[PDB]
CSV table of C-alpha atoms in Angstrom, one decimal:
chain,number,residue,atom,x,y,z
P,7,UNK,CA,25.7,-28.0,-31.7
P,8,UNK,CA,28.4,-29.6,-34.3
P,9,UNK,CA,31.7,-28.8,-35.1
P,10,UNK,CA,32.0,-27.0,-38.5
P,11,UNK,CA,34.0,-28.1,-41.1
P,12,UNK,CA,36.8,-25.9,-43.1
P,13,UNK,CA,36.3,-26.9,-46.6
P,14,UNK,CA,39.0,-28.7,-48.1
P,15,UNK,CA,39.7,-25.7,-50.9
P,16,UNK,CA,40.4,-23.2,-48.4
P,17,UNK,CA,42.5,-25.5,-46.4
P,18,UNK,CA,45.0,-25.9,-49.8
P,19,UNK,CA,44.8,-22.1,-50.0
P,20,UNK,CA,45.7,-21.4,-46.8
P,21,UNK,CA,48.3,-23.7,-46.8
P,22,UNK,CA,49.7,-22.4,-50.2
P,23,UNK,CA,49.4,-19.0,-49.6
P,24,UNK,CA,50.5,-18.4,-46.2
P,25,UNK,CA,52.8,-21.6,-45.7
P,26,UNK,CA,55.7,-19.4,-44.1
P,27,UNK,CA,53.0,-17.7,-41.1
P,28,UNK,CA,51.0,-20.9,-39.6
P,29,UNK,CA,52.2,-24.4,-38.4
P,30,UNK,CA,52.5,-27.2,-41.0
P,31,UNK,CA,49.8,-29.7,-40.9
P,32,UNK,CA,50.2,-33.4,-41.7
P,33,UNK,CA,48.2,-34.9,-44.2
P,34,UNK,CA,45.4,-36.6,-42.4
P,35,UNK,CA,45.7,-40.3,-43.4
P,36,UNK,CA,49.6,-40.4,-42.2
P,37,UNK,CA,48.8,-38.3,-39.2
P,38,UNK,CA,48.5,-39.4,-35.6
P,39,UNK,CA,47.6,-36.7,-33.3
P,40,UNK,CA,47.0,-37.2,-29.7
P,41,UNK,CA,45.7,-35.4,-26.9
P,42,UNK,CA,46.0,-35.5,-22.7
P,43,UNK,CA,43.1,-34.8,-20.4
P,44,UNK,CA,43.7,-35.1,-16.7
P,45,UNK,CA,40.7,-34.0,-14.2
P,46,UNK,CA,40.6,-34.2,-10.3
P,47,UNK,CA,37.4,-34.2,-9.1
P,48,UNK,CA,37.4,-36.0,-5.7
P,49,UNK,CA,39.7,-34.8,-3.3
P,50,UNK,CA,40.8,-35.5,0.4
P,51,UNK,CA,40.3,-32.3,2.2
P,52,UNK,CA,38.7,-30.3,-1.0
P,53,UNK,CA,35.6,-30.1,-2.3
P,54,UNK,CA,34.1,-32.1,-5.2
P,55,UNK,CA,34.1,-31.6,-8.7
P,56,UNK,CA,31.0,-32.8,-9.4
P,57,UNK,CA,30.0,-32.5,-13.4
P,58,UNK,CA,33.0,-32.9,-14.6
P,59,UNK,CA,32.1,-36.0,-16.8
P,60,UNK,CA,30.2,-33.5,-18.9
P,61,UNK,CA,33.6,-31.2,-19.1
P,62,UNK,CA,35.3,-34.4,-20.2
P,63,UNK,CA,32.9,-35.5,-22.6
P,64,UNK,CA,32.2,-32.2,-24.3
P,65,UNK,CA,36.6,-31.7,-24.6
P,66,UNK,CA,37.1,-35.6,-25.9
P,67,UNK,CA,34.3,-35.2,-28.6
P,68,UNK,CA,35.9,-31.7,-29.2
P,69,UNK,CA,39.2,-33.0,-29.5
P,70,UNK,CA,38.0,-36.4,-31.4
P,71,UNK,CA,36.4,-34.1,-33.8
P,72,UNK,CA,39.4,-31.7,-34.2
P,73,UNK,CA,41.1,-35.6,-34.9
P,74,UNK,CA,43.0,-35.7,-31.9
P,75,UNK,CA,43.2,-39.4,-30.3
P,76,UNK,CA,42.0,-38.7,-26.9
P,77,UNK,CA,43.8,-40.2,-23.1
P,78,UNK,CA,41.9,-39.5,-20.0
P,79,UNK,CA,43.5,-39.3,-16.4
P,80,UNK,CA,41.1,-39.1,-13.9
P,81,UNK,CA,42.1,-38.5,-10.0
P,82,UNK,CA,45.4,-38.2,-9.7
P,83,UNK,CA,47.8,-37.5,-7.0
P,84,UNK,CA,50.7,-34.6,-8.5
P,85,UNK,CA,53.2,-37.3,-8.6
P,86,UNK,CA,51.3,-39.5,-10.8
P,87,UNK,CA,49.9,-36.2,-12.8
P,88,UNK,CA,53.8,-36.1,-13.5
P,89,UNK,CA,54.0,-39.4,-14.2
P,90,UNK,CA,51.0,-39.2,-16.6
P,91,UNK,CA,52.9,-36.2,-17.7
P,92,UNK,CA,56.3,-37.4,-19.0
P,93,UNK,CA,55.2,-40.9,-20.0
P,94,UNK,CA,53.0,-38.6,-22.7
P,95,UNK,CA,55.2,-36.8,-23.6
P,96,UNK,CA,57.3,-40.1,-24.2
P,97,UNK,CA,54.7,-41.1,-27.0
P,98,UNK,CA,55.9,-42.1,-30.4
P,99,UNK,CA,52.8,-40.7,-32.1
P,100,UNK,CA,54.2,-36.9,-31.6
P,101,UNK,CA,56.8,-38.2,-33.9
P,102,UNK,CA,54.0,-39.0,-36.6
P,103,UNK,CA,51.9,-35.8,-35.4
P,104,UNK,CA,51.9,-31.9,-36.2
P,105,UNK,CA,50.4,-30.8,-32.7
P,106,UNK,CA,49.2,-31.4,-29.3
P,107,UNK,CA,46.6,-30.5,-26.9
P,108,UNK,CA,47.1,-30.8,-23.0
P,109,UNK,CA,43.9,-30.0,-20.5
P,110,UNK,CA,43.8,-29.7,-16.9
P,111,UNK,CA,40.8,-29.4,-14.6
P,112,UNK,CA,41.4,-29.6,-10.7
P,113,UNK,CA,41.6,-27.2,-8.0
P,114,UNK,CA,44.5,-24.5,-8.1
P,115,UNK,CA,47.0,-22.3,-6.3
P,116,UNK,CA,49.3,-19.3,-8.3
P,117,UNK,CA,51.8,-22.0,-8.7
P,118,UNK,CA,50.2,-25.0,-10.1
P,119,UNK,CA,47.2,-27.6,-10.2
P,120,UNK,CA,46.5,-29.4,-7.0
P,121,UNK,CA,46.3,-32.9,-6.6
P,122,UNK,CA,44.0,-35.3,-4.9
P,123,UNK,CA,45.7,-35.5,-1.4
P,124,UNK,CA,46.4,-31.7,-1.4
P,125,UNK,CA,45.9,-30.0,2.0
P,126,UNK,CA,47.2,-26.3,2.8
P,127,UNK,CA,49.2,-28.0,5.4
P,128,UNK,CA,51.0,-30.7,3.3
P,129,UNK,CA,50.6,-29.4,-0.3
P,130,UNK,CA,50.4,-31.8,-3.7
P,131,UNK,CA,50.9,-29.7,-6.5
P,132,UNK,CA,52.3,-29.8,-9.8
P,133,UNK,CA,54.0,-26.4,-10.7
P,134,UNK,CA,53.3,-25.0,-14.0
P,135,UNK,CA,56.8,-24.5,-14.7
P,136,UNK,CA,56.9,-28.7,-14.8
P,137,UNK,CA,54.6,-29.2,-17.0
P,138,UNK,CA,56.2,-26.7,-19.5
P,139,UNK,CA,59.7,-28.1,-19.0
P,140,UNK,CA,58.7,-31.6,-19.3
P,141,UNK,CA,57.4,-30.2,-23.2
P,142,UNK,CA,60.3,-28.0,-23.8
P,143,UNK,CA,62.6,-28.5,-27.2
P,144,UNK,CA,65.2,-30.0,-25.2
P,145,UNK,CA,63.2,-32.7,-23.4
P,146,UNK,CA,60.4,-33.4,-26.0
P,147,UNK,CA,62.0,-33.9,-28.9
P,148,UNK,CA,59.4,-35.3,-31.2
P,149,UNK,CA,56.8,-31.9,-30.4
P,150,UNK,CA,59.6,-29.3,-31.3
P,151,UNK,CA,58.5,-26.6,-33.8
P,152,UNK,CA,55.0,-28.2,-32.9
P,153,UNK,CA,52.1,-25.7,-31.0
P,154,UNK,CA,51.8,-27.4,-27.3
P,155,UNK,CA,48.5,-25.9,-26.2
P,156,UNK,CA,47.6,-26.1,-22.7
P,157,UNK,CA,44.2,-25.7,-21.4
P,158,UNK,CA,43.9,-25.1,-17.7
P,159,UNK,CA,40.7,-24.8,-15.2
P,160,UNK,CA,41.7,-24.4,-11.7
P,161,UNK,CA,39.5,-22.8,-9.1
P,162,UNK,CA,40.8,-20.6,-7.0
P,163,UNK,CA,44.6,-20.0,-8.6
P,192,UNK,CA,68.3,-18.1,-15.8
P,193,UNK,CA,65.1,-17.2,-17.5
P,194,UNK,CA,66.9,-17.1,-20.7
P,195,UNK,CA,67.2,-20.4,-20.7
P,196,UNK,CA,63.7,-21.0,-20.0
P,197,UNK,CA,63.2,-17.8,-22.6
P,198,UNK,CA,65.2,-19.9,-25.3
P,199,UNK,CA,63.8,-23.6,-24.7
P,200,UNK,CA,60.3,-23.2,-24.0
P,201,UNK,CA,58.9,-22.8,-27.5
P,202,UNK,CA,55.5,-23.0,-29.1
P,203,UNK,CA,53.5,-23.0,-26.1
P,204,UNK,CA,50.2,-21.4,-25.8
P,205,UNK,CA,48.2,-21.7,-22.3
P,206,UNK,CA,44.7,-20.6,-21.8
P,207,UNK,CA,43.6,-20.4,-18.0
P,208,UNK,CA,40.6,-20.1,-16.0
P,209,UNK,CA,40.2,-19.7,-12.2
P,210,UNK,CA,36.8,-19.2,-11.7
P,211,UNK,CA,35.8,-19.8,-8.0
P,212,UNK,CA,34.1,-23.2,-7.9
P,213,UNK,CA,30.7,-22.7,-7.5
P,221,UNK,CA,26.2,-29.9,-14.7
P,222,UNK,CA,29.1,-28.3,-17.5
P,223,UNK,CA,31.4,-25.4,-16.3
P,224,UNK,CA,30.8,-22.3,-17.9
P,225,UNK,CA,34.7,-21.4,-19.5
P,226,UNK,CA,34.2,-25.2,-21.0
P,227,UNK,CA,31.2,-24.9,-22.6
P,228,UNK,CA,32.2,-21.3,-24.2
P,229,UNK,CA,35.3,-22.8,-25.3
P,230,UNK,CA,33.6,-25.7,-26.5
P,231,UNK,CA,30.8,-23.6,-28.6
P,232,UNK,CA,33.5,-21.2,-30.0
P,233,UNK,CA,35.8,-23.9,-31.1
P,234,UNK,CA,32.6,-25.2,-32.9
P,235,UNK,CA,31.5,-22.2,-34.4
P,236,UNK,CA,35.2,-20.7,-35.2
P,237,UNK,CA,37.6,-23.1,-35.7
P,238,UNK,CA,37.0,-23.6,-39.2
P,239,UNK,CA,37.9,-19.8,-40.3
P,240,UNK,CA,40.1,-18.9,-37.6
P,241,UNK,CA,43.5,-19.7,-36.2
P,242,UNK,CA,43.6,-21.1,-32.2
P,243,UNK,CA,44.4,-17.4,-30.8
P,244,UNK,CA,41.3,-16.2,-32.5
P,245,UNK,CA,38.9,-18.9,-31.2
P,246,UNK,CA,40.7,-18.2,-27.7
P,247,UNK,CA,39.7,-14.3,-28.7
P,248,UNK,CA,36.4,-14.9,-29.2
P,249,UNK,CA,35.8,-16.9,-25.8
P,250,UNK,CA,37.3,-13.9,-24.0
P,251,UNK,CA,35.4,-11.9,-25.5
P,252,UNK,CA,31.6,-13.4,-24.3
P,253,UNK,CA,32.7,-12.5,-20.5
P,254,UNK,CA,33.3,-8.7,-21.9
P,255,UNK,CA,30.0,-8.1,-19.7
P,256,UNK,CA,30.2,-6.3,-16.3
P,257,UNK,CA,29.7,-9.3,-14.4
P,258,UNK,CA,32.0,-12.1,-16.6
P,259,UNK,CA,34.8,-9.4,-16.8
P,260,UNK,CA,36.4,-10.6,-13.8
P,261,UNK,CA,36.4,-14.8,-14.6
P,262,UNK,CA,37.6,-13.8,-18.2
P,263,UNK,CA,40.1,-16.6,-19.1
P,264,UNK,CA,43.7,-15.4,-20.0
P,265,UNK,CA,46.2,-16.2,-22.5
P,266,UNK,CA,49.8,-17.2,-20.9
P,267,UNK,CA,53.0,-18.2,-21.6
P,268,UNK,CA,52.7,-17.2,-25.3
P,269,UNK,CA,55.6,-18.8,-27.3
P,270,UNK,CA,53.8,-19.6,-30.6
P,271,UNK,CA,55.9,-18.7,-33.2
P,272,UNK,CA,53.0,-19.0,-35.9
P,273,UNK,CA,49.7,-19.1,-35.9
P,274,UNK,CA,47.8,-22.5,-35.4
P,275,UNK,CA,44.8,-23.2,-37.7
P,276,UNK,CA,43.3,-26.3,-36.6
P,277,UNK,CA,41.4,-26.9,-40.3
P,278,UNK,CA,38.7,-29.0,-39.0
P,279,UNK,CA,37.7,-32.4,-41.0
P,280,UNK,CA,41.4,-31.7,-42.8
């Protein structure tokens, strides 16, 4: 229904009391937050999308409420999803901000998030890995120390290095088959509203898992991956 509110007191407590164990905020009137969606929903040899304006509504009014400025991408080959990519995370605002949220909704493979020309036979596909190096704390300066949180529906889905650069990342993934609103949006959507004013990101992601803990959900339950976080993430709604 609406997104509830943390009140303002236990925001300063929280913030006083447990300053060292959950990502600094910015005070809201110097802050300037933004937020990525990209969705694919027409496709040259796949099958439409078709609802996804509800998805996109439902996240940007999510976001928008959580005070995240909101850029939509719609229909995008992967070259230009990189594009999209890299010129967002080129934004001055991340200097000015104390987070970001990233969600993708297309078709998938293991590897990545298809594009609009993808075809088994000459594949378009931006690789996970990408989209976390392009964010990393070498290449995105202005989001270091910052939680990147990357929200991911796509149907059908040395490293020390990568270990020691790819920091504060938190992705949460559905691949539900495809086939009005999909049903790991609107959960994520109604727990956000109903959780994120008392609990930190990893708990609202907790409680979404935990509505498909019924024999037949069990096997679209969405994962957490690529964990980095090195704090916990309370979103303080309306702070």
């Amino acid at each position: 229904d609406a997104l509830k509110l943390c009140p303002h007191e236990e925001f300063l407590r929280l913030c006083k009391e447990r300053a060292e164990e959950i990502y600094p905020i910015k005070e809201r009137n110097n802050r300037t937050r933004l937020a990525l969606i990209i969705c694919n929903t027409e496709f040259d040899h796949l099958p439409p999308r078709n609802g996804a304006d509800f998805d996109i509504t439902g996240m940007k009014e999510l976001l928008e409420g959580l005070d995240y400025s909101v850029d939509v991408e719609e229909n995008l080959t992967a070259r230009d999803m990189e594009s999209a990519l890299r010129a967002f995370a080129t934004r001055p605002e991340h200097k000015s901000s104390d987070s970001t949220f990233l969600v993708l909704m297309s078709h998938g493979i293991l590897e990545g998030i298809c594009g609009t020309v993808h075809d088994e036979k000459k594949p378009d596909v931006l690789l996970y890995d990408t989209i976390f190096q392009i964010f990393n704390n070498r290449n995105c300066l202005s989001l270091k120390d910052k939680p990147k949180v990357i929200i991911v529906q796509a149907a059908r889905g040395d490293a020390v290095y990568k270990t020691h650069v790819e920091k504060d990342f938190i992705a949460f993934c559905s691949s539900t088959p495809h086939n009005m609103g999909s049903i790991f949006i609107t959960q994520l959507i109604t727990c956000f509203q109903k959780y994120s004013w008392c609990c930190h990101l990893e708990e609202v992601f907790r409680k979404v898992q935990q509505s498909f803990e019924t024999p037949r959900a069990k096997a679209q339950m969405p994962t957490i991956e690529r964990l980095s976080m090195t704090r916990y993430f309370y979103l303080f709604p309306g702070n």
